[PDB]
Amino acid sequence: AQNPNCNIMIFHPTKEEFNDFDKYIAYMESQGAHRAGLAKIIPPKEWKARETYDNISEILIATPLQQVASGRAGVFTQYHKKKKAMTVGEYRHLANSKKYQTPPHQNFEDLERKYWKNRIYNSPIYGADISGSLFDENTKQWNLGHLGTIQDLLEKECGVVIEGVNTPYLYFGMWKTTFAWHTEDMDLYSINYLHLGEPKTWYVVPPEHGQRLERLARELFPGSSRGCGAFLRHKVALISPTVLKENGIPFNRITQEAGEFMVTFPYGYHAGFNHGFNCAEAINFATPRWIDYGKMASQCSCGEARVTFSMDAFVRILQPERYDLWKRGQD
Ligand SMILES: O=C1Nc2ccc(Cl)cc2C1=O
Ligand SMILES: O=C(O)CNC(=O)C(=O)O
Ligand code: NI
Ligand SMILES: [Zn+2]
Numbered sequence: 001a002q003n004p005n006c007n008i009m010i011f012h013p014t015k016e017e018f019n020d021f022d023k024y025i026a027y028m029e030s031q032g033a034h035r036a037g038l039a040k041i042i043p044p045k046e047w048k049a050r051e052t053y054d055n056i057s058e059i060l061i062a063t064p065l066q067q068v069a070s071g072r073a074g075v076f077t078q079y080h081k082k083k084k085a086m087t088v089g090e091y092r093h094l095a096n097s098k099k100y101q102t103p104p105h106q107n108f109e110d111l112e113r114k115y116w117k118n119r120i121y122n123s124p125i126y127g128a129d130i131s132g133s134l135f136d137e138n139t140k141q142w143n144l145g146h147l148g149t150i151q152d153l154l155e156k157e158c159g160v161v162i163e164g165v166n167t168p169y170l171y172f173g174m175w176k177t178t179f180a181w182h183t184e185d186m187d188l189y190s191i192n193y194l195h196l197g198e199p200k201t202w203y204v205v206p207p208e209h210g211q212r213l214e215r216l217a218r219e220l221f222p223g224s225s226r227g228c229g230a231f232l233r234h235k236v237a238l239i240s241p242t243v244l245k246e247n248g249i250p251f252n253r254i255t256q257e258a259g260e261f262m263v264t265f266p267y268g269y270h271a272g273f274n275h276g277f278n279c280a281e282a283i284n285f286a287t288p289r290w291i292d293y294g295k296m297a298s299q300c301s302c303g304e305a306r307v308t309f310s311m312d313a314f315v316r317i318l319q320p321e322r323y324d325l326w327k328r329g330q331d
Helices: 021-030 088-095 108-121 150-158 207-220 222-227 241-246 290-296 311-318 320-327
Strands: 009-011 038-041 065-072 075-082 125-131 169-173 178-182 189-197 200-205 237-239 252-256 261-264 269-274 278-285
Touching (some): 009 021, 021 038, 038 252, 150 278, 150 290, 150 311, 200 207, 207 237, 311 320
Parallel strands (some): 009 038
Antiparallel strands (some): 038 261, 065 075, 065 125, 075 237, 125 169, 169 278, 178 269, 189 261, 189 278, 200 269
C-alpha cells in the first residue's frame, strides 16, 4: 500500500498535468495521498488565480464573527458572536491594528507555540463562508468556481438527478482565527486556495483513524457528547497537538502559504489557525470514491449543525433511513 504511514504529501504538477482536475486527484490517490487526510498542491509556476489583488477592498463581510473561547489552553470550545458589517478594507485595517496583529516571532514553530499558549485569552474576528470567488473567469485550470458539481457527480455515478448547487466560499482571516476539528459535510472532499496574505497552519487525522479522534472528543467534551451523537458537526471543538500526542491520536501538521492549494479527503478530520491577515477560497467536491463515505457519514440531528439546501438530496438519496428519521433537526 502507498503511503502506509499516512504522511501529508506535497505535489508539484506541471502545467500539462494541471489541465485535468479529476485526473490529477486520481493520480494523487494512486500515490496514497488520501491516507493522510490532507495534501498540498503547489501550482505550476506559469499559473495564476487572477492578475492582482489590488481591487478587493470593497467586498463586504456582512457578518464578521468574533471567535470567543471557553475552556483550557489545549482543550476548548469557541462560539461565534455576530458583529456589524465591514468591508474587506476595514477588516484588513482591523487585522493589522495593535489589538489584533500577529506578535513578533522567530519562525512558524515559535508562532505555533504562541497560538496554543495564548489563543483562549483573545477573541479574533473571522469572515466566514462568504459566498463568492476571486478566481478570474479566464483562469481555466483549478478554478474553484468552475469545478464539476457534486450533484452532477452523484448523477454520473448513481443515475439519479437531484436539486442543488455547489458554489465557493471566501474566508478572510486574521491572527488566531481558528477552524475547529471537523470533517466536511457528508464527508466530502474540500479544496482550499490561499489567495493572499499570511499563512494557515493545518492539523489532520488520517481517515482510517478518525474514530480515535471522535472517542477522545467524547471524553474531553462529555456534556457535548451527551447532547449529540455527532457533536463535532457543530464545528466548535479544539484540541491541541500536545493533547493529541498525550492521548496517542495519530495526526500530522503542515503550513499552507499564499499561492498554494490544500485538498482534504473524505473523513479526514482537520483543524487549524491563521497567522495574520489573509484570504482563502474553498469549496466541496466529490469523486467516485467519495460515494461510499457519503453513505456512511454521521449526522447531527440535535439541530445545532441546521446545513445547506443542497445537503438534503445527499442525505435523502444516500441515507434514506437517516433522512426518514430526521423528518419524523434542520426543521
Ligand atoms: O443538523 C442537522 N442534522 C441533520 C440530519 C439529517 C438531515 Cl436530512 C438534516 C440535518 C440537519 O440540518
Ligand atoms: O480555512 C478555513 O477557515 C476552513 N477551511 C476548511 O475547513 C476547508 O477548506 O476544508
Ligand atoms: Ni474543512
Ligand atoms: Zn448536533
